Enzyme design. Structure first.
Site, PDB file in Angstrom:
ATOM      1  N   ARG A  59      37.466  65.726  33.313  1.00 47.96           N
ATOM      2  CA  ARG A  59      38.051  65.235  32.076  1.00 47.96           C
ATOM      3  C   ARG A  59      38.206  63.727  32.042  1.00 47.96           C
ATOM      4  O   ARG A  59      38.106  63.134  30.952  1.00 47.96           O
ATOM      5  CB  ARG A  59      39.349  65.975  31.740  1.00 47.96           C
ATOM      6  CG  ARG A  59      39.056  67.384  31.218  1.00 47.96           C
ATOM      7  CD  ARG A  59      40.323  68.094  30.774  1.00 47.96           C
ATOM      8  NE  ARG A  59      41.216  68.426  31.884  1.00 47.96           N
ATOM      9  CZ  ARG A  59      41.187  69.556  32.585  1.00 47.96           C
ATOM     10  NH1 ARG A  59      40.293  70.512  32.317  1.00 47.96           N
ATOM     11  NH2 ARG A  59      42.069  69.740  33.561  1.00 47.96           N
ATOM     12  N   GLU A 112      53.939  68.761  44.722  1.00 42.12           N
ATOM     13  CA  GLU A 112      55.260  69.389  44.801  1.00 42.12           C
ATOM     14  C   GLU A 112      55.192  70.614  45.722  1.00 42.12           C
ATOM     15  O   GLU A 112      56.152  70.926  46.436  1.00 42.12           O
ATOM     16  CB  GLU A 112      55.757  69.776  43.407  1.00 42.12           C
ATOM     17  CG  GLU A 112      57.254  70.047  43.339  1.00 42.12           C
ATOM     18  CD  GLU A 112      57.677  70.723  42.047  1.00 42.12           C
ATOM     19  OE1 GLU A 112      56.850  71.441  41.439  1.00 42.12           O
ATOM     20  OE2 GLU A 112      58.847  70.545  41.645  1.00 42.12           O
TER      21      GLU A 112
END
Ligand SMILES: Nc1ncnc2c1ncn2[C@@H]1O[C@H](COP(=O)(O)O)[C@@H](O)[C@H]1O
Ligand SMILES: Nc1ncnc2c1ncn2[C@@H]1O[C@H](COP(=O)(O)O)[C@@H](O)[C@H]1O
Ligand SMILES: [Ca+2]
Ligand SMILES: [Ca+2]
Lengths: 173, 174
Positions: free
Chosen positions: B61, B98
């Site tokens: 992208r 995370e």
């Protein structure tokens, strides 16, 4: 003669799968002088033709595909492997030598009457480009042509594409 | 106000790719020639006169506007990708998420000392990927003139994760 482009193309056997004789165009992409030549060569047969949209086929077709859209003051449309696009899609499935693949395009990517240039870095078997033509046409787009940097001539991918679509390849490898 | 038209065109798709993620879909900007032109002009406004030699696009992208940025600047284009997705010999940077780690890569011949590099992605979120990309470019000897993102998810504070010496330009704050 486009020898400086031809010389720059790298072959990496067995990428992304064993058996594929991968044509790596990153040496062209990374040098502005060769990038300029590649874009000019891709666009030459399409001078003074109204192009509304450029379709880039999958990640590696996005790279020159986007540039073509920008150069032509056109919109850019990504066509992707199944599941990669976020919005509602039209899909085309197609038979491979072994197995099947599915590609997709957003339902609002192309409007009836759009004049469309389809691009990918490489045409091999032509299966993906054939299915992409079908997607564009289902949406009401008219395919002005396909523009590929490289054709793998041995595979005769041109023969898989419908007679009515003009096909331009810059390099025959 | 031209920029407000860009903002309004961005589409959010809930639960893509993984459930919970609020995906910012820029295809309505990409597909409309006028919006696409505005997007490129806005991304480049701080960078047009900076002698940029290479534009890096982060993943699929980021290749879309990334290639156009390179073409517009008469610069070379360099793809940065997730591990295993590039064909040639690579250098790699692993970085913390995370939950777990990710790794990005770049061809060993993509960037040279002296290169003045612009890094692009469509969206900056946590900034983990762009941080790692800065490290790659610097290890190759490039100088990061700046980053240019179409969309900054300001809630995620990605700017804070990027090192302070790299200018960061974002067109839209969402
Ligand atoms: N040898 C190769 N080098 C680089 N890309 C390839 C090669 N073979 C196939 N591809 C790409 O893989 C997809 C399938 O190509 P095709 O067989 O033409 O449908 C297209 O995006 C092609 O550009
Ligand atoms: N909400 C989102 N919409 C679209 N792209 C995203 C979103 N969050 C992250 N990304 C992309 O996911 C990758 C990881 O982002 P980051 O967390 O900034 O490292 C980058 O390529 C981002 O552009
Ligand atoms: Ca123009
Ligand atoms: Ca590898």
């Amino acid at each position: 003669a486009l020898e400086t482009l031809k010389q720059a193309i790298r072959t990496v056997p067995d990428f992304p799968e064993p058996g594929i004789q991968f044509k790596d165009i990153t040496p062209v992409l990374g040098h502005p002088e060769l990038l300029r030549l590649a874009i000019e060569a891709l666009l030459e047969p399409f001078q003074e033709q109204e192009i509304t949209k450029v379709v880039g086929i999958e990640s590696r077709g996005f790279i020159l595909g986007g540039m073509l859209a920008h150069h032509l003051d056109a919109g850019f449309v990504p066509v992707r492997k199944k599941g990669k696009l976020p919005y509602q899609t039209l899909a085309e499935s197609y038979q491979l030598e072994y197995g099947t693949d599915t590609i997709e395009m957003h339902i609002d990517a192309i409007e009836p009457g759009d004049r469309v240039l389809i691009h990918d870095d490489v045409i091999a078997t032509g299966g993906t480009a054939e299915a992409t033509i079908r997607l564009v046409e289902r949406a009401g787009g008219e395919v002005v042509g396909c523009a590929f940097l490289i054709e793998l001539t041995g595979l005769q991918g041109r023969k898989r594409l419908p007679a009515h679509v003009p096909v331009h390849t810059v390099l025959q490898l």
